[model samples]
Target chain A: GGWGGSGGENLYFQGDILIVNAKDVDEMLKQVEILRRLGAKQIAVHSSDWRILQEALKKGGDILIVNGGGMTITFRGDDLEALLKAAIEMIKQALKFGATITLSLDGNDLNINITGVPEQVRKELAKEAERLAKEFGITVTRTGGGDVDEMLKQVEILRRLGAKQIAVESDDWRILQEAL
Target chain B: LYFQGDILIVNAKDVDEMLKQVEILRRLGAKQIAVHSSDWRILQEALKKGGDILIVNGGGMTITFRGDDLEALLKAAIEMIKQALKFGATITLSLDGNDLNINITGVPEQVRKELAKEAERLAKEFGITVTRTGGGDVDEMLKQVEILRRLGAKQIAVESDDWRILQEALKK
Candidate 1:
């Protein structure tokens, strides 16, 4: 999306944070920290643009979590176990939203719901969410369901599975009320 | 790394047929494997019979990773962290590059750690890359140039985690 083209590695910025997917996390952190010292806030690394992950972890505004699922292509069944394992990393990212990001790979759809999102950021985040899901051989569906509908669906599904307190995003109104 | 080969999605019923398909790919020098949209049982089978590489999409079309073998044991647990935070739930995520730890409420510990072990082992074995903690967030993602340098990870599989943070980190 930067200089390369339809698909290429490009570096940008997450406010003041710098993220590198390279092998050198220490170096990257040091370099980005120099930026922070010079004024950057947080920095991170990934195997590309996954800053959302850092935000939730560090719980910062402009955190970064670099490359994952995108640049590479997975086989149909080489190690499905590994592929599926790796794909869950997205859920790690959604937590950063400071709102809610419900991620799931149901059938062929890798759903990412970012709730309490300011509509403007939601649109952009949606694009990244969709692209992220695409790499996993799944699609991120925007059924256009409102927050309440999405929340209900997530809760019911997890509930049926016998989960008492599922992910923060998927829960009933009673639990939501408790959190609120 | 970019393959247009026919991808045989294997279910329990399709396992035998899928294995048959892989042999042909191997015959044609195909050395990689990517399990797509795979759930728990299917992913577990792949892990036990390790070869090529495995990409765990998620578990249970439902949500929780409850089946026999999860595509990603630890990674799936990590996801529950974000899903939980929205509820004011507290889950500590420990990520040191390839390895990840997710301690969340209502999520299975055994199931989550199993996947985490696999993720760590895979990244170390294949030299799979990771971005985290701090510094230029996107660079650690392994660009075409970097992937070319790395041998086992030519077919780099970017998962959902990297996508969100990478974008926000590189907005400027």
Candidate 2:
């Protein structure tokens, strides 16, 4: 009926939310739109286009949650100082949308730790991040990547940093439950 | 630090832990069973034991199933995804991404459309690399798969056993 392509994910819902891995933004929007038509109040939309996601947010009325760590990738510069500067700029850019930004800080692309740096420097960076988020009035739920155990540890670390919310990808119920 | 949702990652100290973990996931109402186990045996067993669980790989892409009930819902799921990637969406579910809560519903076409849409966005936005990772009674499953195919969802995941029923759907 449409342009020809084949295959799709096995679809289901966990709780009231419908979970799926889509191939692109339009597909995800199709679902979000369907949910809207079905009288669903809030929908979490993950799309590739920042432009599309922003447009969706602009049409906003329903509670729309968007994953936004990609902005950090967009902003990060040559080194750590540049990263912090980039984060400040990135936070400012996304803050205008009046949406929550979920940043993945798994010590790789998002190096939340300054292991070899001076303690004071680490403290300064932390304070800067906290201050920026506070100023923008946007919630940044930190996330971590890699193995199950690492994600669990990141849960602890983010919370200790005064994060009220964090995101992780792990399947161990006990660890996740305990971390939460 | 906290979210009102659940994720299914299998971390077993032993086989007992693995089995018990699945039980916990069910108790928690987990719809997908994503395995990140050191034990290959557990992954294999879950692939064999298909029901409420969807065996996922470490990267959080590709859901593996045992065979076909031939559910239209399953086929519908496939077609919608094909259409999305056919467009220009990218999808990746990171272990580090936010906990996405989902609910499956009544219609196969609707569910398939919703799933494919969201999946595409994630891939495009996150720049995730790809990786790989069902199933059930024949008669009922076959019916589902056909409905899905007609709905234009061409792909379906099934256990090695139920491939026969899937063959029937293919003719349609």
Candidate 3:
């Protein structure tokens, strides 16, 4: 079974991942109906608005990508600690919805992927990650081919830190396969 | 008068420096000055600072959405339009190439016709140009000024780069 697949007779989860990037709630509902007809199983929605995410969850979306980039762009304050604190708060709320949350880490942005963790554990991990990011910045660099060992080490570290699911970029899929 | 009834729109990448540009445009015979920015915060600041018109670039407003979904794109554009209109300033939509070319597969004929009708309706209702030519080369933009004027644009907006050429052309 794939990321969000739960052992169906379907070979290869084709048309399973749908990105519901609607402009508003009304558009989102329409898209969700269209996607459902098209065999979409795991719908991923990205938004800085909590209301949008809540609506997405209500409309059968399982994966949520926190729009940290959008938040950072719109955020008035330049305070790093305050920004991270805000982001962590959002992550905690999303986790409480019982959906798989994927966070993107690009440059100064902070996003992580976590699932199947206890609510209290998720909160603690998120708080700790925010504190760690504030104290010592998260400098993420991708290891291409021939660095599977290094990638595995990073994966192991994340797993140890209570990450239930670790997502790897397409280029780094070999490392994931190797780890499994 | 170089700018006479036309709203000379300027892109304020730096919000703080926009007021100076307004003064300079006023000196150059610009009767009405509109400050344009994609960022809502910047647009609010521009409105607070007394911008006569607010031009929201379609590209900046709708570039965040991923695929070439026309409905999504249109919805996003309309949302921005609504938000800009709330400032009580004259709002103009710069439907540039990015906004027009969002779908790699060209827009359906039905959608295209409906969009044109909607643009016309918006123009009539809000007194804003929802179908104005976007910024481009000096020569093409100068030509657009005449075209837009003929089509009954209350105020023609031009980019900073094309302002001088437009001023000279209008003078003649």
- Best candidate (score: DockQ): 2
Q: Candidate 3: misplaced stretches above 4 Å?
A: A1-13, A71-180, B1-109, B114-172
lDDT of 3 by residue, B39-144 (tens): 4445556555555654432111112222243233344344333222222111222223223221110122233344445445544554343433222222433343
| DockQ, each predicted model | 0.02, 0.07, 0.01
TM-scores for all candidates? 0.24, 0.27, 0.24
Predicted structure 1, TM vs. truth? 0.24
Tens digit per residue, CA lDDT, model 1, B27-141: 5453343332222344334434422433322111112222222224344444343343333222323332334433232223343444344444444554433322111223433
lDDT for A61 in candidate 1 is 21
Full-model lDDT for every candidate: 0.32, 0.33, 0.37
By the TM-score metric, which is better: model 1 or model 2? 2
RMSD of 3: 23.5
Better of 1 and 2 by lDDT: 2
Fraction of the reference Cα-Cα interface contacts (below 8 Å) that each candidate reproduces? 0.02, 0.07, 0.00
Residue B36, candidate 1: how far off, in angstroms? 34
lDDT of 1 by residue, A1-180 (tens): 341222335322222123332222333444444444434343433222122233222322232222111121222223334334444454344334323333323233323333433334444455554565466554333433333344445334434443322122111222223322
- Could you tell which candidate, 2 or 3, scores higher by DockQ? 2
Q: Indicate which candidate wins on lDDT.
A: 3
On a 0 to 1 DockQ scale, where is model 3? 0.01
lDDT minimum window of 10 residues, candidate 2 chain B: B98-107
TM-score of chain B of each: 0.28, 0.27, 0.33
